[PDB]
C-alpha cells in the first residue's frame, strides 16, 4: 500500500519512533517520503549489487537478507521479503537497530540529502 502522510505519521508514532535516538517523528516521515514515496512495496536495485526494500528502503548488504547480495551481513536477522508488507513493524524494528549504530540516520541516503537540517516537523504538521 501507499500510505498517506498523516496516516504514516500515526503508525510510526504508535510504533515508538518519535524521538527514537533523538530523531523526531518528522525525520522518520520525511525519510519515508524521499526513500519510498510512502510505498510499502517499493524495491530498488543498487549500484553495489544490493537492493533496498520497503517503506524505509532497508538495505540487503548490511541489514536484511535477499540471498543475492555481495558481502551481506544480515545484521537485522530477517529476509528482505518480510519487509514488503502493509504492516510496518518489521521495517520499524530494523530501523531502530540501524539508527543505533555509529551513523544514526545518515544511514539513509535520501534522509541525509533531503531531510537532514530541514523543517522536518512540517512533515507531521496538521496530523492528529
Amino acid at each position, epitope marked *: 500500500k501507499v500510505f498517506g502522510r498523516c496516516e504514516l505519521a500515526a503508525a510510526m508514532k504508535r510504533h515508538g519512533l518519535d524521538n527514537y535516538r533523538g530523531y523526531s517523528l518528522g525525520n522518520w516521515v520525511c525519510a519515508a517520503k524521499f526513500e519510498s514515496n510512502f510505498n510499502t512495496q517499493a524495491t530498488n536495485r543498487n549500484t553495489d549489487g544490493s537492493t533496498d526494500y520497503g517503506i524505509l528502503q532497508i538495505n540487503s548488504r548490511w541489514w536484511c537478507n535477499d540471498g543475492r547480495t555481495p558481502g551481506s551481513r544480515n545484521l537485522c536477522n530477517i529476509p528482505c521479503s518480510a519487509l514488503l508488507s502493509s504492516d510496518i513493524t518489521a521495517s520499524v524494528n530494523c530501523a531502530k537497530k*540501524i539508527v543505533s549504530d555509529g551513523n544514526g540516520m545518515n544511514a539513509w541516503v535520501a534522509w541525509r540529502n533531503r531531510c537532514k537540517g530541514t523543517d522536518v516537523q512540517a512533515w507531521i504538521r496538521g496530523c492528529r
Partner: nanobody
Amino acid sequence: VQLLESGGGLVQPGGSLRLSCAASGFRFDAEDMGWVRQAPGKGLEWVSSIYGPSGSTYYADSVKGRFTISRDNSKNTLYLQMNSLRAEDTAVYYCAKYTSPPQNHGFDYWGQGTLVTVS
C-alpha cells in the same frame, strides 16, 4: 574526495581493456569500492566490488571470469581488467564508493565515467 576514470576507447570483440580510477581524499587501502556501468538506454548496473582490508572481490554474473578488479595501494588507483569483450559490454564505466557506510542506496559517489565501445 575524488575518483577519476580513464581510458576506455574502442576495442574489437574478444579484445581486452584495462580501466583505471585515480582516487584521492580518503584512506584508499581498506575502502569498499567498485565499478558500475551504464549501457545505452539502461540504468546504472553493478559490475564488481572489492571490500575491506581483505580485498574480497565480487562480480556480477555477466562478467564473472572475464573481469578482474584490483587495487594498487602505492598509487591509490583502482583497476578493472576486462577480457573477452562482447558488444553488450559497451557502456560508460564508473568507479564508485560509499560516502558514509553502512548505508542504503549502494555506492553513492562515482566519477565522471569513461566510455567503452565494443564493435
